[PDB]
Amino acid sequence: SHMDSEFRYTLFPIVYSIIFVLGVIANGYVLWVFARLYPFNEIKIFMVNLTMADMLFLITLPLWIVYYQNQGNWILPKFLCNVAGCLFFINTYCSVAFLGVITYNRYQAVTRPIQANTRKRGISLSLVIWVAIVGAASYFLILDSTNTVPDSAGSGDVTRCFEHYEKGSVPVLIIHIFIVFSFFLVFLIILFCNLVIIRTLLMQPVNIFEMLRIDEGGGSGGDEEKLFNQDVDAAVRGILRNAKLKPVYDSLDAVRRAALINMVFQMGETGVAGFTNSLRMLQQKRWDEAAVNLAKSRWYNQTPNRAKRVITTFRTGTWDAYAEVKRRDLWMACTVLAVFIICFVPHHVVQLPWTLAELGFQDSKFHQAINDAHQVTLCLLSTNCVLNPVIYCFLTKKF
Amino acid sequence: HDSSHMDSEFRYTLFPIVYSIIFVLGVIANGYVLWVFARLFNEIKIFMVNLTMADMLFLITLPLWIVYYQNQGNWILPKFLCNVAGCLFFINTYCSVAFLGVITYNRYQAVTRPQANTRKRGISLSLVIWVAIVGAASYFLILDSTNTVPDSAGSGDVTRCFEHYEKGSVPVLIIHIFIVFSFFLVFLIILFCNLVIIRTLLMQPAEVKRRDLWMACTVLAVFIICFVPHHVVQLPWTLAELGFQDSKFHQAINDAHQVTLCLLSTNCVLNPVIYCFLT
Numbered sequence: 247s248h249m250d251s252e253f254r255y256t257l258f259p260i261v262y263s264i265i266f267v268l269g270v271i272a273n274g275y276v277l278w279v280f281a282r283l284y285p286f287n288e289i290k291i292f293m294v295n296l297t298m299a300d301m302l303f304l305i306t307l308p309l310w311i312v313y314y315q316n317q318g319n320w321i322l323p324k325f326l327c328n329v330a331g332c333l334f335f336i337n338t339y340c341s342v343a344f345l346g347v348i349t350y351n352r353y354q355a356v357t358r359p360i361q362a363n364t365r366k367r368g369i370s371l372s373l374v375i376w377v378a379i380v381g382a383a384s385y386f387l388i389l390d391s392t393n394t395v396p397d398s399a400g401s402g403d404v405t406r407c408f409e410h411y412e413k414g415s416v417p418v419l420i421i422h423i424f425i426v427f428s429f430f431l432v433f434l435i436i437l438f439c440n441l442v443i444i445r446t447l448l449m450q451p452v453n454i455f456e457m458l459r460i461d462e463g464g465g466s467g468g469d470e471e472k473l474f475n476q477d478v479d480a481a482v483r484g485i486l487r488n489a490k491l492k493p494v495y496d497s498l499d500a501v502r503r504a505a506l507i508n509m510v511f512q513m514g515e516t517g518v519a520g521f522t523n524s525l526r527m528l529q530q531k532r533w534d535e536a537a538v539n540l541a542k543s544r545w546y547n548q549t550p551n552r553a554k555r556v557i558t559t560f561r562t563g564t565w566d567a568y569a570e571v572k573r574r575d576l577w578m579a580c581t582v583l584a585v586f587i588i589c590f591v592p593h594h595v596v597q598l599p600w601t602l603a604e605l606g607f608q609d610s611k612f613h614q615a616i617n618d619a620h621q622v623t624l625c626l627l628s629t630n631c632v633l634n635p636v637i638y639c640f641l642t643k644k645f
Numbered sequence: 646h647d648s649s650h651m652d653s654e655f656r657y658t659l660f661p662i663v664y665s666i667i668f669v670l671g672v673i674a675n676g677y678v679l680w681v682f683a684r685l686f687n688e689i690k691i692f693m694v695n696l697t698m699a700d701m702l703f704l705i706t707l708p709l710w711i712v713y714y715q716n717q718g719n720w721i722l723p724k725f726l727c728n729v730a731g732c733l734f735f736i737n738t739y740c741s742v743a744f745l746g747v748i749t750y751n752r753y754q755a756v757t758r759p760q761a762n763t764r765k766r767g768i769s770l771s772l773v774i775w776v777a778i779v780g781a782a783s784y785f786l787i788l789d790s791t792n793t794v795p796d797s798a799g800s801g802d803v804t805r806c807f808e809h810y811e812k813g814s815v816p817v818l819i820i821h822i823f824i825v826f827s828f829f830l831v832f833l834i835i836l837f838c839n840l841v842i843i844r845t846l847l848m849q850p851a852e853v854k855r856r857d858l859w860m861a862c863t864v865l866a867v868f869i870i871c872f873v874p875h876h877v878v879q880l881p882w883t884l885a886e887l888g889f890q891d892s893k894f895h896q897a898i899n900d901a902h903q904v905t906l907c908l909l910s911t912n913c914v915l916n917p918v919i920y921c922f923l924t
């Protein structure tokens with residue numbers, strides 16, 4: 247029949263049954279959460295496009311349950327197997343692509359925090375990804391999906407679906423090598439991006455460099471905070487060279503000096519020098535009065551979250567304002583990494599040795615072990631339709 | 646961050662004691678087993694000599710760490726020796742993991758599916774392992790291993806060896822994720838391979854079957870005692886060194902790290918034990 251055969255005919259009918267029911271509930275409810283949202287916009291498109299990918303897979307699951315309940319016999323017409331295989335490839339790589347693009351969006355939102363045609367970009371990208379993956383998945387519709395073999399007992403035959411690999415196929419090896427190398431290349435980008443977001447939003451600023459990294463941004467993680475030190479020193483040099491800003495600056499403590507520096511990085515010496523009254527309240531250590539007067543500016547209307555953070559730093563002289571910043575993003579980063587390492591990485595680790603075993607290039611004792619592993623990763627990869635809807639909690643839930 | 650290291654005096658007591666014991670015992674047991682092989686299945690014997698060479702490399706670095714921890718974490722010796730110490734410690738850790746795993750797989754295919762080609766195959770595979778591991782270990786030679794930092798008592802400056810970690814480094818963290826994941830991938834292939842050996846050896850229907858079954862247990866003993874404690878701690882500790890944790894966790898995981906580092910060194914003394922359970 248097959249190497250891993252024994253348990254696969256029991257595994258998939260149970261595993262895929264749970265997944266079918268949970269995944270149809272989770273993605274169906276997610277289309278209720280999406281519908282009830284008319285007031286993030288770009289991320290919303292990727293999420294809805296990701297659900298569209300899940301629906302395509304979920305609908306094929308009844309066919310796999312029956313195929314495995316029939317001891318691996320594809321009794322329906324051949325093209326329904328072509329379509330089933332095709333939609334599996336679509337689900338997997340649209341999910342890899344849409345999780346990838348959600349990660350990049352959030353990375354740019356944290357790393358570079360600076361039109362309503364952002365929606366036009368989410369739609370533009372989603373289409374590129376669909377054309378790229380549906381185009382690649384189309385090859386599954388031109389293949390001979392099934393192979394007929396004599397049954398072990400009786401007078402019958404067994405019709406396998408996308409299990410047959412012509413012994414020693416070279417295109418198969420090149421295609422499977424490309425996909426795995428392209429996957430871990432994509433996985434490395436995702437891992438780096440989500441670890442930057444996490445690193446940035448976990449590690450609470452204790453200086454002006456870390457403080458301006460949250461509010462203004464800064465690419466990757468380097469120590470050679472030394473280049474940015476130069477920009478701050480040049481900013482302080484000018485502040486002290488300004489008769490309107492020097493008395494206040496000199497009078498302030500190091501944490502409050504950073505808040506003034508922050509303001510200067512945002513609106514410049516010119517901008518900050520036009521806060522005569524608020525600056526006088528600071529020079530006189532009238533923290534609450536200064537804080538209240540600072541909230542009565544256009545700065546507060548224009549950038550409220552940064553203003554609130556800087557005003558708090560002026561009021562308290564502590565870094566508490568930067569303790570739990572952008573938690574929607576911090577949790578998004580963890581969730582995308584969970585969905586990636588759980589669902590996609592196991593399958594992609596097991597993929598190249600299993601293809602080599604299935605092209606015969608590996609021994610019978612290993613071929614049997616890697617086949618068993620393969621059935622487990624194929625189940626892990628299917629949990630994606632139940633797991634990936636969790637990301638919607640970024641849109642709904644507040645911290 | 647180097648200021649958080651003045652709180653752990655434990656390592657300066659632990660390493661000079663434990664590394665002196667490991668050095669002497671190891672140099673003896675390894676020097677001894679090199680005479681066992683000199684006064685002489687054949688493929689397995691090739692992996693064992695190489696595995697003993699990985700041990701010697703690290704054993705020769707032990708007197709340097711003894712001196713280092715003796716001088717309260719001050720690398721009094723030349724700074725280049727620090728790169729060489731780190732390099733050889735990495736070689737020892739992963740040449741051991743590879744050669745033990747390659748021994749485990751030799752006995753797996755020799756039990757589940759049983760001369761001049763095996764000797765040549767074993768040398769091939771052995772040279773692959775050295776090239777792969779020494780290739781990665783060589784990156785320790787191009788780093789800035791040493792960092793001058795103040796001492797617990799006064800304004801005096803000590804020189805650390807491979808203790809500096811750039812705050813919030815994502816690539817340092819990615820490397821450690823790669824190595825910890827690869828280790829548990831390699832270890833689980835080993836765990837399965839060995840457990841199949843002990844299962845097939847427990848259910849076979851006299852002396853040949855009795856030694857190879859008890860050998861699969863030695864490879865597991867070495868993995869669970871020496872390598873698994875360290876690779877469990879490696880990630881939580883790395884995170885602590887990159888500033889991703891609290892001071893309370895920092896101290897807990899750093900102390901555990903000293904224990905697992907000592908436990909990793911016991912592999913020099915525990916792996917020559919495989920020589921008898923086969924030859």
Ligand SMILES: C#Cc1cccc2c1c(C(=O)c1ccc(Cn3c(C)nc4cnccc43)c(F)c1)cn2C(=O)N(C)C
Nearest residue numbers: 258310330331332334335338407408409418421422425624
């Ligand atoms: C992912 C992927 C992939 C990417 C590119 C080429 C692929 C694959 C691919 C598969 O790994 C693959 C494996 C099993 C099947 C069919 N399949 C089977 C037999 N059981 C399944 C349980 N869930 C989903 C699909 C299942 C399939 F349609 C594609 C086989 N491919 C292939 O080269 N074939 C010649 C089928």
Ligand SMILES: C#Cc1cccc2c1c(C(=O)c1ccc(Cn3c(C)nc4cnccc43)c(F)c1)cn2C(=O)N(C)C
Nearest residue numbers: 710730731732734735738806807808809810817820824906
């Ligand atoms: C294993 C491994 C590894 C793999 C990849 C990168 C590694 C490491 C690595 C280490 O774990 C590491 C830790 C401590 C030391 C130095 N070290 C110290 C301070 N005490 C030691 C006692 N025994 C052996 C080595 C000792 C080292 F050379 C390497 C540090 N690495 C690193 O990121 N550095 C910036 C040195």
Ligand SMILES: CCCCCCCC/C=C\CCCCCCCC(=O)OC[C@H](O)CO
Nearest residue numbers: 291294295298329332369370372373376380
């Ligand atoms: C015969 C079987 C093989 C054929 C398989 C066909 C796969 C389906 C193709 C696209 C999914 C459609 C959903 C997403 C495509 C629209 C992209 C877009 O612009 O997203 C707009 C967004 O939803 C605005 O809110």
Ligand SMILES: CCCCCCCC/C=C\CCCCCCCC(=O)OC[C@H](O)CO
Nearest residue numbers: 739743773774776777780781824827828831
């Ligand atoms: C064939 C021998 C494989 C060794 C089994 C060790 C298993 C322990 C897992 C990770 C630590 C070792 C990481 C070594 C992986 C190679 C990375 C590298 O950069 O090495 C360069 C190499 O020479 C050019 O490919």
Ligand SMILES: CCCCCCCC/C=C\CCCCCCCC(=O)OC[C@H](O)CO
Nearest residue numbers: 781783784785786787788789790791816820
């Ligand atoms: C085709 C050319 C490809 C070449 C591209 C390299 C591929 C990196 C491979 C493994 C990671 C090795 C980790 C690199 C070690 C970091 C060393 C470093 O950054 O330098 C020392 C620094 O000054 C701190 O003291």
Ligand SMILES: [Zn+2]
Nearest residue numbers: 248249604617
């Ligand atoms: Zn097979």
Ligand SMILES: [Zn+2]
Nearest residue numbers: 649885886899
């Ligand atoms: Zn530390």
